[PDB]
Amino acid sequence: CAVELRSPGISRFRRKIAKRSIKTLEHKRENAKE
């Protein structure tokens, strides 16, 4: 099915959920000491 060809349903919002969790992962070992 063409789920991400013309209208990517869920995909435009699934990444926003990941961008909120992944940012915390990035700000863990790279946001401590030096």
Side-chain angles (χ1 to χ4, degrees):
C1 280
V3 302
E4 61 152 271
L5 200 87
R6 206 235 76 93
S7 296
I10 306 136
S11 212
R12 206 242 251 243
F13 123 97
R14 78 170 223 103
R15 277 185 163 158
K16 224 271 270 204
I17 300 157
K19 273 186 171 140
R20 186 189 114 197
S21 204
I22 282 170
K23 196 205 96 229
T24 313
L25 220 297
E26 257 132 50
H27 289 78
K28 215 289 176 220
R29 66 115 139 79
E30 290 136 295
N31 215 98
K33 300 287 109 181
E34 186 254 284

